[PDB]
Structure 1
């Protein structure tokens, strides 16, 4: 949608991820692993519930109203009774139809946003030690074992610890 992460630079979703809405898969020294990110999952979920609750906010109640079904033909007053109701129904129908369009459009951009925010957040944290492969994966240029991967995930990764190892691996090479 607006941010181009979901169905954008991230080619497709993971049907396998059952524990959250957004997350990480890694391949490292000890092998391959997956894990949901619960902060962004909760961020997207809370906004969609907030949105949901506003829409389920109070059916107002009405009691004696006007007749809306007639069995004899009367002319002027009955034509107006029918015309008041039919224009009320078309106006409320227009409202329902535009409300779910705006809402749905926004829910897609919002969840796209959260994807992109988690990406940016991980980008910023890896500093000079990783490069973006451009499909939502980073290439980490230093030995990063499972505890290392867990510190990126839980947000405590210290880039300085691996900066010389990474900068060497990443640049120097032979050019």
Structure 2
């Protein structure tokens, strides 16, 4: 949670959303149901499977080398033949023991990204038409349904046309 979102303010785990990596949860008149997304599920996993192609399966093919295990006490050259290879290992190790620390840590703010950039999307295509109930979930003023749903869940939503319920239930109702 660098970007915040995941394990940040959406502190709940979507149990078994298997139709993908993301989605919503409508509480319309027709009950409920957790819908699966794409341009975000594919988007993230698009990248993860990118940084990885980099890492996994690639370079290095060396043939005849220096020896590395030793039968008798030789001194010096021996001493050296060691300290050269040792030093290599040592290095290659730190290089690895970090390629992870980085690639990994940033693998995270990479998922905690697609999130804080979807809610931050809906909360755009629709004005005073509704607000993320407190946090986590949203709050709607219209009687949106399964059909009506294919709005946000398709970026097919008019905060203009489909606006009637605006001021109303908001700050307008008695107080």
Fold equivalence (TM over 0.5): yes
Cα deviation, residue 20, structure 1: 0.9
Cα deviation, residue 163, structure 1: 1.8
Q: Deviations over 1:13-48 (max 9, x none)?
A: 212201111110111111111111111000001100
> 1:6–1:112: 8 Å Cα contact kept in structure 2?
yes
2:155 corresponds in structure 1 to 155
Alignment size in residue pairs: 175
Greater mean alpha carbon deviation, residues 27-36 or residues 53-62: 53-62
Normalising by structure 1, we get a TM-score of: 0.95
CA RMSD of aligned residues (A): 1.2
Greater mean alpha carbon deviation, residues 13-22 or residues 158-167: 158-167
SS at match of 1:49: helix
> 1:11–1:135: 8 Å Cα contact kept in structure 2?
no
Bigger fraction of residues in strand? 1
Unaligned runs of 5+ in 2: none
> 1:9–1:134: 8 Å Cα contact kept in structure 2?
no
CA distance in 2, matches of 1:118, 1:27: 18
Cα deviation, residue 169, structure 1: 2.5
CA distance in 2, matches of 1:70, 1:76: 13
Segments of 4+ moved more than 3 angstroms: none
Normalising by structure 2, we get a TM-score of: 0.95
Greater mean alpha carbon deviation, residues 75-84 or residues 146-155: 146-155
1:165 corresponds in structure 2 to 165
CA distance in 1, matches of 2:35, 2:22: 9
